[PDB]
Amino acid sequence: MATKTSIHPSVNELYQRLAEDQLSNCFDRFDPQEKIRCNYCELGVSCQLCSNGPCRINEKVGATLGVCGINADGMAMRYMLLRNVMGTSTYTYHAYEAYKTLKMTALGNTPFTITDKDKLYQMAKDLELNTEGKPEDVAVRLSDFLIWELYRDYDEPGKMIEVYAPLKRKEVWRKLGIYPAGPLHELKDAAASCLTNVDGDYVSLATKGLRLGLSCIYGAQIGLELVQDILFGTGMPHEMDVDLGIFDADYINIVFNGHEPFVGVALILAAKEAVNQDKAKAAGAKSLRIYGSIESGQEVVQRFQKDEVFRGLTGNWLTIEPMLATGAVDVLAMDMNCSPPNLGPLAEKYGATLVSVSRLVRFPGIHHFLDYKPSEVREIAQKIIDIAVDSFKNKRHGKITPKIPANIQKAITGFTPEAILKALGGSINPLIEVIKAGKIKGAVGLINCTTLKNGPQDYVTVNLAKELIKRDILILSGGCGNHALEVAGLCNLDAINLAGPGLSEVCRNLNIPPVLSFGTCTDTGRISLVVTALANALNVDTADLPVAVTAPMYMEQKATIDALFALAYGLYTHVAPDPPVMGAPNLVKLLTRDLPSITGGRIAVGSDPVKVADDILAHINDRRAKLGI
Amino acid sequence: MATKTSIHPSVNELYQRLAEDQLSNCFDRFDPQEKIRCNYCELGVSCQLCSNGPCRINEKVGATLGVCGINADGMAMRYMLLRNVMGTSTYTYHAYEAYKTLKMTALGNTPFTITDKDKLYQMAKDLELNTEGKPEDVAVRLSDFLIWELYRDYDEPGKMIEVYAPLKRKEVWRKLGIYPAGPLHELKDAAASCLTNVDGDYVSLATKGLRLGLSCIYGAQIGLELVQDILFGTGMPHEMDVDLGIFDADYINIVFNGHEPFVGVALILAAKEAVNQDKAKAAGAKSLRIYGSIESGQEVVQRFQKDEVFRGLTGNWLTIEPMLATGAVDVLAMDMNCSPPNLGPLAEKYGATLVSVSRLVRFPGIHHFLDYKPSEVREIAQKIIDIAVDSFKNKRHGKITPKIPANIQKAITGFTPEAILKALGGSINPLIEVIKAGKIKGAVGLINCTTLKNGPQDYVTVNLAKELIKRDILILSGGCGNHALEVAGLCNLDAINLAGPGLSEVCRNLNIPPVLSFGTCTDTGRISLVVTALANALNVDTADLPVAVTAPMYMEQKATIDALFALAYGLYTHVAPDPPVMGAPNLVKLLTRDLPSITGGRIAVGSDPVKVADDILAHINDRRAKLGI
Ligand code: SF4
Ligand code: SF4
Numbered sequence A, B: 001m002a003t004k005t006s007i008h009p010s011v012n013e014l015y016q017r018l019a020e021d022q023l024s025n026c027f028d029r030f031d032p033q034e035k036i037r038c039n040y041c042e043l044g045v046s047c048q049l050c051s052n053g054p055c056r057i058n059e060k061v062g063a064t065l066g067v068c069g070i071n072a073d074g075m076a077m078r079y080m081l082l083r084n085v086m087g088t089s090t091y092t093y094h095a096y097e098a099y100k101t102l103k104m105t106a107l108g109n110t111p112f113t114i115t116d117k118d119k120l121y122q123m124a125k126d127l128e129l130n131t132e133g134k135p136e137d138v139a140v141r142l143s144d145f146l147i148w149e150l151y152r153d154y155d156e157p158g159k160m161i162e163v164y165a166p167l168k169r170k171e172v173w174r175k176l177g178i179y180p181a182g183p184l185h186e187l188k189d190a191a192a193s194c195l196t197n198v199d200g201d202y203v204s205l206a207t208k209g210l211r212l213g214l215s216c217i218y219g220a221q222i223g224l225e226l227v228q229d230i231l232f233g234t235g236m237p238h239e240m241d242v243d244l245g246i247f248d249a250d251y252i253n254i255v256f257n258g259h260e261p262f263v264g265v266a267l268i269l270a271a272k273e274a275v276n277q278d279k280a281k282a283a284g285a286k287s288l289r290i291y292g293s294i295e296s297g298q299e300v301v302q303r304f305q306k307d308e309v310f311r312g313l314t315g316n317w318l319t320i321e322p323m324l325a326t327g328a329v330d331v332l333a334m335d336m337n338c339s340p341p342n343l344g345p346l347a348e349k350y351g352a353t354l355v356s357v358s359r360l361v362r363f364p365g366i367h368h369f370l371d372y373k374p375s376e377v378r379e380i381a382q383k384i385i386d387i388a389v390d391s392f393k394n395k396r397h398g399k400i401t402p403k404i405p406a407n408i409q410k411a412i413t414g415f416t417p418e419a420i421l422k423a424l425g426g427s428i429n430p431l432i433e434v435i436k437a438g439k440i441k442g443a444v445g446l447i448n449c450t451t452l453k454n455g456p457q458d459y460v461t462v463n464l465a466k467e468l469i470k471r472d473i474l475i476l477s478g479g480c481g482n483h484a485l486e487v488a489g490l491c492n493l494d495a496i497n498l499a500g501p502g503l504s505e506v507c508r509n510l511n512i513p514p515v516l517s518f519g520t521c522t523d524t525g526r527i528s529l530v531v532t533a534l535a536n537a538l539n540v541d542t543a544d545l546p547v548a549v550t551a552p553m554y555m556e557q558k559a560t561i562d563a564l565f566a567l568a569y570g571l572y573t574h575v576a577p578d579p580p581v582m583g584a585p586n587l588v589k590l591l592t593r594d595l596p597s598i599t600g601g602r603i604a605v606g607s608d609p610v611k612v613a614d615d616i617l618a619h620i621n622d623r624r625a626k627l628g629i
């Protein structure tokens, strides 16, 4: 087959139904695009930012510069920066909603509560906040403080970056002048820099991208993830079911899909009410069940158990169209990306009802708009159930043939920095010792999406992970790439048998898998806490550690903002497919060759799993040599 | 040559020097681009937002949707929304700096003062602020309030929109649900919506664009322009010199260029110090002179007189390269767009020194970086003078042959709402009366850039303005298009005789030109105060008034965000060249034909001055007919 589908049997089975039903889908839509691909855009050397365009760089025809005078390096880095404003904006949006949700929870107007009170008070103490009064008082103060971090300008010093970044990185960032403003001002400044005839200097634009990455992690991601832990618990390792075989067509099936978990949690709470299970049964269903999809799903499985109501995680974004083709979904409730914009016809064909639960998410054919507000989430969740009951009765049951693949996989979800320390007996030292001894050569942060650009869904990701663990490299994973490895079975104890000799031994002694599910791409900041702990304990800089990052099937700028962060944090950062920059030679030289002398990090490229793994291992072994281990 | 150059003889003369010197320039760089133009990008039906791209819509080869499933209408509107995040960000950036500058002025830390105290106290009264204490105390409170407007989230009601918008518009916006958040949250929400697999609904994306336009005018532009008036005075009509003949090579010549006028004002104040003049003469110059370029220059000519130090306005952004070829500039001090990124080689050839005065502005070959802070602007201005004296002595004097064109034109600058009321005897009603009587058919806000896309520099703008005034349509102008009309002589009393029978007679009796210079594209909000005053005087909605807007040589999203505002405000809004949307037929239908039933406004297109003017007049006459006049 000349059409890239998927490495996953479940998805290929459902692709077959979409094709038989003659429904458009991402896999098939790839092929027409291949007839007329623009190589200028592929290489980053086109521009559409003003009316003197559209421009292209082509020296042979005399088009060395854009009409305005910008060169290829400035052109490519500027559009990268602009797109990364979108990525930073999504993290900033999510963070603000988390903080408003914590505040309104403390004020009594949500179905949530303060669950991890120890984290709330420890964070408050680390931030030098007033901890007098009751937990609700402290939660309000924390929320307002973290909103201030979002809103801080160019000239007001941050506190989160001082608490959560390692010492030696701080001196690098001070020398380079890249301590960022809060993400709201930083993304506004970056967007303003990208307007025509403002910032046309590729070095400056790259520096602004590194600042944007730092602003996202310290100014949005770390606060939002810890606040979600305060609300919903800090994840600990537990068994979860994944893949599309978790569906049972005889139940009313509600799937929540996005990045923000608030609606999902509210749905689980509501579905556990006897009145709602009775509604489902009165409608002819066996009972009512909730399923998580993509990143919102992963947020929930990190912190919640499988039970009779919540059934597990469906898969990553390229599984959404196949998932509708099961003919088993009653409501798909969509809160952020990825909610692909041609789902309308598929929902109609397979008898599913689409519900947007964010003002961000709109596309043709959505039936219902229930935009999120914390004080309304209880009522939103109940309305979704009511919609699902009616949909089951009148759109799906007795009308739609279900086609649910048998594939279910088990994954150990819920690794957090706290889970790792517990597994090691309360200190990071045992991990340091197994690294020094060479049992584990190093560790990789796999922080990734999925795409079709460089292979069938998840092909590069899964095979690269297998090659890394064979080389005794431990993986901490987040994002759609984490869902892929979970579905592929790399996150359970059976996966120990795929690891090399040193990592297999450590995994068996600690009773952990060789791939540790750390959650979402929003958890890049949290993963940095583990790397920071290693750097602080060894008193070496992050750039000196035997680690690397890979986003090997990146799709959009949630992943690239995490890559820009990784570069600023000093790390070897592999990205595939190539970002649109390869036509800008001085920018390529900066990112791939010169950044080691600037931040310590560098971009690495390629889609061959074996070569990429060998290059990562070579970098790790170079770091090991310099450490004398 | 067949290269599109300019309608201005001065620019054409200096283009010849650039060409003879074989220096790259915008005019010549247009031609290579014309060889390889992408029609997908021209029509808005390409996409580069994720790794599954670059995508193109071409139904003839089966590429009906992007890989993700988005259609052509969603694709085109989404990229328009993303680019307009940049436009909004630049206005928000400027507003924030204006508010910090007012605050730091009130605290005594700048070379500025509170000039228009009446306006300060009137704003405080209208906004229900505390007016106790001294004017400086009130200025601090106003600054903090206007910063709050910048930061307001989507769920907190704004006050500027209540005070400064008319009753019926507020009702329409309420009914449509398009009351925006503050511009910081609104631009973050817009950017997040544009990430792949978030908002792919062209109608929703267009609605978000309308909201973004409203947020920009009420949340940034009106506040910033009124605060600039508080600091530097409210413009009143006065005679100004324009065009490139204002230079004299025997002086030390400092040009400020951008949109934010703070550095330019500080430079004028410093240049008036006798000590600095003495320094210039000791260096061999006759004295030290300051000149304004583009929008920063226009802000200053609106409010300041020509004198021995401040000499006037050079022209719009396509004049910057020609200006350097005069061989008369000692420092070009650049604060924002437009600062074209290949000026370095031109500055080197012609003996000028480039200084960036904003962290936004970077490009190859800049000599000095003096990022603006209010408390440092006195030191910044003095350092620029010191740089300029050294540059005159070492780079230019006796080394560079000047070639200053002879052309100088007179313009009456400084029209504001206050100036119109004064010219009418204190009330708007005499203008209403001559409009009702048919002497003036209606009024157009010409809010525009300049570009080469649809003609030689300023060709469409000037010829359209001539056709409009011939049809007895009064013009209120802002932007690079206003600079064009000043240089072309449409803004002096001689231009009365270019107007039609009714408008010429009215202008002769009132002693005003038929084109009233209202300043910058940042003054769209201020122009809306005049249109709002007309709506209130006639007791009708803005969509019912005999007015229109035109951006007839738009370049980037400072202009398009004003056009989006104008559509939301209910106006016929002509834009040329075509924005990149014409390949999206449903989006075109929405913007050009269905919006009148939604907001009342519509987009109009075309670059033929006679046809565009006839279409504007036909809309105005339709509005007149429905008003009974
Ligand atoms: S910003 Fe420069 S390179 Fe981009 S379209 Fe405009 S003229 Fe061309
Ligand atoms: S967002 Fe959609 S249309 Fe744009 S490049 Fe990605 S797949 Fe193609």
Ligand code: FES
Binding pocket: A038, A039, A040, A041, A046, A047, A054, A056, B038, B039, B040, B041, B046, B047, B054, B056
């Ligand atoms: S699709 Fe237009 S330049 Fe690439």
Ligand SMILES: [S]
Binding pocket: A447, A448, A449, A479, A480, A521, A558, A559
């Ligand atoms: S990601």
Ligand SMILES: [S]
Binding pocket: B447, B448, B449, B478, B479, B480, B521, B558, B559
């Ligand atoms: S403009």
